[PDB]
Design a protein around this nucleic acid. Structure first.
Length: 337
RNA sequence: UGUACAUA
């Protein structure tokens, strides 16, 4: 069966001045339609509390089905953003008992995220309690991980301890997971020092593997860009002596750049001198490499003058030849700009 | 000249 006459006429531009009240008895049908849903979304704000209640009445009967609908989920979200406190509370009761199922659903997870941004701390903690015992399942889920991230962003850290507890012994597995690595970073941004300490401790049991992992390299870079000095120095200690090799790696080259950027003055001198203070060809190998040439350029940018002079002494003899090299030519281009 | 992060 197909679209009602009213919906089809609306879609064919037959009612260019249509209003919400004209949709009586067809609100759910419009909400399940791409264009009908956009119409409701656009009209809900600027509408009168009386208009919203007729809309709210019809969706409420079908609230759960709309939360998981490709087009209806936006209408539910619109009531979390523009509804009265009572409407928001009534929607919370429709979510109650279904948080996990919605969090794992590709459209339901959008409703849960919007709710978390839109409701009181008390109402947030009702939602979070339903994820206790299902943390790892949600974190490793393509929809659920976004709900867990949003909880960490928006909810009092005290109520998040169950996530920290569930992550014990799982930090390497999650930091190397396409979805888990996102949640680890949210934890490092938003959780308390007592919560991040066991995460960081466990992280540091796996530094060398994480640095060269497809997803773990982002977690390591996060700590270098945002973490405490003590943790940055631990990380830098897994890179010293390894600059040449790691700079040639697609993933780890980015870690090397963050090490030289966020190091202390002395650590940065140590890492840069490793590849230019000895009489070896490390810097030349790096300049010609598809990834390490970016590391050389970063070292040029962050080097204090003493180290810049040392780099330039290694570079200058190769300048004329570098212009023909696929990646090396970018060193010459930088220095000739 | 270089890697993740989702709806019409």
């Amino acid at each position: 069966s197909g679209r009602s006459r009213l919906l089809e006429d609306f879609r064919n531009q037959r009612y260019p001045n249509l209003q919400l009240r004209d949709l009586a008895n067809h609100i759910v049908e419009f909400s399940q339609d791409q264009h009908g849903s956009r119409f409701i979304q656009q009209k809900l704000e600027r509408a009168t509390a009386a208009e919203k209640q007729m809309v709210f009445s019809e969706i409420l009967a079908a609230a759960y089905s709309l939360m998981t609908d490709v087009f209806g989920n936006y209408v539910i979200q619109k009531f979390f953003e523009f509804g009265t406190p009572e409407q928001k509370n009534t929607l919370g009761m429709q979510v109650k008992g279904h948080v996990l199922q919605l969090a794992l659903q590709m459209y339901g997870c959008r409703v849960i995220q919007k709710a978390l941004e839109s409701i009181s701390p008390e109402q947030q903690q009702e939602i979070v309690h339903e994820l206790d015992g299902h943390v790892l399942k949600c974190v490793k889920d393509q929809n659920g991980n976004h709900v867990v991230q949003k909880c960490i962003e928006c909810v009092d850290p005290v109520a998040l301890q169950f996530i920290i507890n569930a992550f014990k012994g799982q930090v390497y597995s999650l930091s190397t997971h396409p979805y888990g690595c996102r949640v680890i970073q949210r934890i490092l941004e938003h959780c308390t020092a007592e919560q991040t300490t066991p995460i960081l401790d466990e992280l540091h049991e796996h530094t060398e593997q994480l640095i060269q992992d497809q997803y773990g390299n982002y977690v390591i870079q996060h700590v270098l860009e945002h973490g405490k000095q003590e943790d940055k120095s631990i990380l830098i200690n897994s890179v010293r002596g390894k600059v040449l090799v790691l700079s040639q790696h697609k993933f780890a080259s980015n870690v090397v750049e963050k090490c030289v950027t966020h190091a202390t003055r002395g650590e940065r001198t140590g890492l840069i001198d490793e590849v230019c203070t000895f009489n070896d060809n490390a810097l030349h190998v790096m300049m010609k490499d598809q990834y390490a040439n970016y590391v050389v350029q970063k070292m040029i940018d962050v080097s204090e003058p003493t180290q810049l002079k040392k780099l330039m002494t290694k570079i200058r003899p190769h300048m004329a030849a570098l212009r023909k090299y696929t990646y090396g030519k970018h060193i010459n281009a930088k220095l000739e700009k």
